[PDB]
Assembly symmetry: C4
Homo-oligomer: 360 residues x 4
């Protein structure tokens, strides 16, 4: 009855989060007894598996503080001067589940590129007290990224470095050999991303998260699942497939703590959201779009809802912690099954004249 993850993904099919479900297990505990403790890198641990994306319409100091206070972490974007990014990290560091360091200050992440401006940008961020840095690229398996990783681990031996983006075990081997402390996974699955239309390169997100995690777990390197998360079930699926944490953009967009002001159109409230490879953000080929997302309220209200939903999902599948979810996934005890297009219709809201969908 059911299929194990190894035989679900080694079929060669192009599986996404919407193409499968997890089969229910046995329940002998309540939902809020479930532990969501998660390893971000080899040496940084969070109370929750949630990470904010380093985009200029998603993460500044206000978003980073709110994610850290709710038990996650925020990565500040680099579409600004080195001075500005360092000042934002300083505001986070100088501000029950809160994510904190050895001095009891909030944890903060930052993003950098792989050019020579980024070697100076790194120094300002290290002086500002950054806890972890992510090399922000579409295709992280490059000589430019490998030279940047080898430079950082020599200059600042204490710093935690996240490599990527990657979608295959061959790409992960080079970055793990180069000494990264974690891997960012996904290519083209993001809500605002058109990289697969424009360059024919990418991967369906569920098989990518599963494949890279199966290779990376052998070296003690955790995986961050990034792009294409639309709901709490997508977070549960990403963690169940081997990811240690989940990074999101559009799902945290249009919250009170996200950068940019609110506006009105068609009688409803909106906030701007755009890809870092859109012409708006940057002979010059575009890799993303710019648009808008509906208002979602404060992260101090929305993150507790995601936490309750992940706990309820772990209870339905029979696991007391995310560590136990991944252990029963790799051992073949957790079970999955595919969905046909008809099953996807049967699984959504159907056969009603009209309906109202409130989540919490």
């Amino acid at each position: 009855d059911g299929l194990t993850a190894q035989q679900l993904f080694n079929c060669g099919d192009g599986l996404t989060y919407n193409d499968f479900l997890i089969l229910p297990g046995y329940i002998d505990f309540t939902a809020d007894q479930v532990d969501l403790t998660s390893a971000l890198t080899k040496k940084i641990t969070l109370k929750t598996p949630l990470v904010s994306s380093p985009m200029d319409t998603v993460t500044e100091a206000g978003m980073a503080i709110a994610m850290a206070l709710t038990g996650g972490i925020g990565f500040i974007h680099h579409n600004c001067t080195p001075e500005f990014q360092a000042n934002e990290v300083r505001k986070v560091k100088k501000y029950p589940l809160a994510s904190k360091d050895a001095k009891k200050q909030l944890l903060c992440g930052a993003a950098i590129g792989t050019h020579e401006d980024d070697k100076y940008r790194l120094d300002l961020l290290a002086q500002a007290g950054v806890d972890v840095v992510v090399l922000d690229s579409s295709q992280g398996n490059s000589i430019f990224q490998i030279n940047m990783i080898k430079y950082i681990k020599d200059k600042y031996p204490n710093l935690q470095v996240i490599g990527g983006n990657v979608v295959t075990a061959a790409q992960a081997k080079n970055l793990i050999d180069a000494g990264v402390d974690a891997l960012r996974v996904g290519m083209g699955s993001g809500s605002i991303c058109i990289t697969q239309e424009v360059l024919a390169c990418g991967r369906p997100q569920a098989t990518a998260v599963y494949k890279v995690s199966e290779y990376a777990r052998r070296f003690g390197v955790p995986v961050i699942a990034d792009g294409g998360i639309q709901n709490v079930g997508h977070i549960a699926k990403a963690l169940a497939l081997g990811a240690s944490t989940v990074m999101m953009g559009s799902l945290l967009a249009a919250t009170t703590e996200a950068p940019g002001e609110y506006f009105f159109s068609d009688g409803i409230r909106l906030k701007k959201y755009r890809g870092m490879g859109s012409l708006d953000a940057m002979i010059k080929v575009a890799q993303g779009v710019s648009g808008a997302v509906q208002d979602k309220g404060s992260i101090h209200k929305f993150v507790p809802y995601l936490i309750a939903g992940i706990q309820h999902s772990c209870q339905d599948i029979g696991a007391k912690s995310l560590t136990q979810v991944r252990a029963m996934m790799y051992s073949g005890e957790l079970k999955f099954e595919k969905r046909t297009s008809s099953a996807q219709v049967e699984g959504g809201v159907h056969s009603l004249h009209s309906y109202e969908k409130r989540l919490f």
Copy 2:
């Protein structure tokens, strides 16, 4: 020519009712010679395979009386004070194919939870003379449900108990060992249900109905197929896959006997219909939506139409009774075949400028 059910469902695919058809057989009898007699539990038998769902917008005493008079049964909902549910059961018991007990009163079902308030609710329902009780949960394979079943079978040895919801043979083993008299099958396939999108857990309904019934038939325990029934063909498919009875919500919603008033919107008549896990019905995470369904008239006219349609379907496939349909299915005499997206388009109404679809 064609595939048996055993080789149709052991392929590992995510099959739903819309993904297959039943191949025609040989006809040597008229349609109204077909017998629809069905076992609800180990000791309760109905003239028809139809069951009303225990939802607050579907089953109260008026709905339960009409279903029993038409040869089916109604399960009264528990989103009310225990006094009110016992009084509704009392009104059903105080009221040619009618479903009745040894005292010649109509048969009545009731629903309860698995908390400690439900031990008191159970005693009032037993006082009121209830014939069968269903433990109403999204994931019935739990210590809470198993302790509730073992308590009921000791306190009232005469009472018939229905377990679930379940979608796998591993879940059914625990409830059959605990002593249930029938199993409720389905998770997330309901018209008003978003559990699969919020918690990533569930199963396509046709494979769930087929697999739980194949395990349960060996212990003499019948199966009730619940959620995702849109038409008479779905009822015929559910019974052909091994189910003894079929439970529906939205298909019996907006009938004259269902609870709640009628109202007009967009020039047409409607009645409210909602999931028991919707915020409207019940820090708190929603598992269903609330909406509306178009008016359908009285169950005293609508149920006879479903009965005639199931008889016509049994005639087309060559069987004189539902018992014979399940016997031909398990022996490999009955045949099935898959449908691609193009076959589903060819099977619906197509190639017309406009059309009118009256069923009876």
Copy 3:
């Protein structure tokens, strides 16, 4: 390179006409050198493979005359008094590729049921000079149809009888043993049919046409492909899969010779079209809808377009006659390939702001 029909259909998939294509061959002749001569029954031959459906919104004497004059045949419907159907057959018989009998009168077909009124209806049609009769049923594998066939072949040994509808080789065995002269194939594929929705019984049309023809060719019994023909490519596919002739409803509906008046709605011209199992046409369960189809002009203009299109299709696949098309299909010389949903999008009109589709 490519797949033979035997290995395309013995995969167990639910294939429809839209799910595959025919691979091109070698051309050494012009398009109008192709011969479309087709056997309707064991003793009736037509210049073309086209047959009009016996529906009350499709075939009366005017349609039957035009179909016969253009090289096909028309089957008159039975939703009228036996007197009226016999008078319509009389008007066809009383009237360069024209379909004619030994007396040089036009050929005419008629439809009858399997009840005892039909034994009298048959005699009026036989005296009216009918050339062939079809038993008009949704599921022709019945004791009622077998007794009717055995009665007709004894009463009128000269009469040609078409059995069906069938979709499997097991159904065809009984009717071929009973002595039918041809088989009508298809169940639920028609434009106005909801039999699969309501009774769960039917079959995808391309696999049904292929499987019944493969069994029937061994006894010299031809096959008529009926229901779900939307364009000339569907006619070419039906003939290539083993059918001797193709029957259509909606494709010949709203022509000048079809019964019923024209009317205007939404600024365009329409004619009524309905299923024989719709409540409009006939305690009672509906098996079809009633609607409308856009005007197509005269059959004396429209049938020549279908003839030219089938000749062009035979030229592209490399065959000088329909006999040679079926010979290369059964020998494995003709090749086919499957289509994914994306291939169906690439195969239709795509990537335009607006367009106009003119066929001839």
Copy 4:
């Protein structure tokens, strides 16, 4: 990890460009170091892989000059007098990556049919100095085309002849034996083509491009991929599957250099675009539609964008030239993976209220 092209296309599935992706490789060079040099025929080489289609709404002398100046080539259409086509070729020959001949004049292509008017049309095009000629047919594997090829290679031994259209290795064998210098590939995949609807004959474009190229590479004969190119990723996929050059219609339609005037509808600017087999372009059966495409600016701006996009795609997959892309594809070093319908949705723009899509 991933599938090679040989095992992706030998599955028998109906694959299109949208049904797969290319997995990323290793990067150790910048994007504008990538070489796009491409062989058009056995003796003509271009700086870029881009070709203009010979359609009356796409290629006249203005379009041919602009494509040649940007490093590609244009084929002039033949839906005009032979005198007019020769005069257009004359204007192209009379006019840093520019495509040129031994006399340092721009390269020019022309189209001809397989009738006896075309033997005279050929002589005027040779008079005018044409560099290459394409035999313009829907099904090029015919006695008419083979006699035309054998006539041209004897009359003008210096002329380069392109055969087709073909979609199978059996069709290519006859034209390669006849002595063609290149093959045009595709049937029914074009934006304005309904050949698969009307004649049931054609092939999904990605499998056709891959299979004809695998057979043709053994004889040193290059392949031109024609029809169904919607974006830069489609060009990258076509070249990666073995094509030497890519031909497009709709993607170059509504540019400043394309023939026909601009017009306004619904507040936007448009230009007419139609299939050569539409009734507008030419008892007669249509094989294409006529419509409109939105304005796209000058080819001197649009072609550089396509060049930058193909270079970026080659960089993401790890290749310094198109020659190396095809070498990694045939050796099994390049990797691909399939996409389910859900993966195609995840890969496009999703989960936004509104968005703006600018490419450059």
